[PDB]
Amino acid sequence: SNAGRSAADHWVKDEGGDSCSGCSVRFSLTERRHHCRNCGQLFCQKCSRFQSEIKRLKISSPVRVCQNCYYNLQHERG
Ligand SMILES: [Zn+2]
Ligand SMILES: [Zn+2]
C-alpha cells in the first residue's frame, strides 16, 4: 500500500547536474554553484549564500551547505 508523488504545475524536471535545487536557475559565470555535502543537492550562491562544515556528516572541514543546513549547523551547539 504505497503512493506516488507529483505537482500541478511542472512541465519539466532535470534539476540534477548544473541547476539550482531551490530555484532551478541554470548555473553560469554569473551564478555560482555548490553541491551541499549534507543533502547532496546543488544550490545557487543566493540559495545558501553560506559556507561551513557538517559535523553531522562527519565533516570537520568547511564546505558548501544550504541555508536549511547552515542554520542547523550554527545552532548545532545550542
Ligand atoms: Zn537557488
Ligand atoms: Zn543541505
Swiss-Prot record:
Subcellular location: Nucleus membrane; Cytoplasm, Cytosol; Nucleus, PML body; Membrane
Zinc finger (FYVE-type): 14-74
Residues that hold Zn(2+) 2 according to the record: C36, C39, C66, C69
Annotated tissue distribution: Expressed in osteoclast and their mononuclear precursors (at protein level).
Record-annotated membrane-spanning stretches: none
Residues where Zn(2+) 1 binds: C20, C23, C44, C47
Superkingdom to which the source organism belongs: Eukaryota
Domain notes: The LIR (LC3-interacting region) motif mediates the interaction with MAP1LC3C and other ATG8 family members. The FYVE domain mediates binding to phosphatidylinositol 3-phosphate (PtdIns3P).
Protein function: Required for selective macroautophagy (aggrephagy). Acts as an adapter protein by linking specific proteins destined for degradation to the core autophagic machinery members, such as the ATG5-ATG12-ATG16L E3-like ligase, SQSTM1 and LC3. Along with p62/SQSTM1, involved in the formation and autophagic degradation of cytoplasmic ubiquitin-containing inclusions (p62 bodies, ALIS/aggresome-like induced structures). Along with SQSTM1, required to recruit ubiquitinated proteins to PML bodies in the nucleus. Important for normal brain development.
Disease: Microcephaly 18, primary, autosomal dominant: A form of microcephaly, a disease defined as a head circumference more than 3 standard deviations below the age, sex and ethnically matched mean. Brain weight is markedly reduced and the cerebral cortex is disproportionately small. MCPH18 affected individuals manifest microcephaly with mild to moderate intellectual disability.
Subunit organization: Directly interacts with ATG5 and associates with the ATG12-ATG5-ATG16L complex. Interacts with p62/SQSTM1; this interaction is required to recruit WDFY3 to cytoplasmic bodies and to PML bodies. Directly interacts with GABARAP, GABARAPL1 and GABARAPL2; the interaction with GABARAP is required for WDFY3 recruitment to MAP1LC3B-positive p62/SQSTM1 bodies. Weakly interacts with MAP1LC3C; this interaction is direct. Does not interact with MAP1LC3A, nor MAP1LC3B. Interacts with TRAF6.
Protein's name according to its UniProt entry: WD repeat and FYVE domain-containing protein 3
Protein species of origin: Homo sapiens
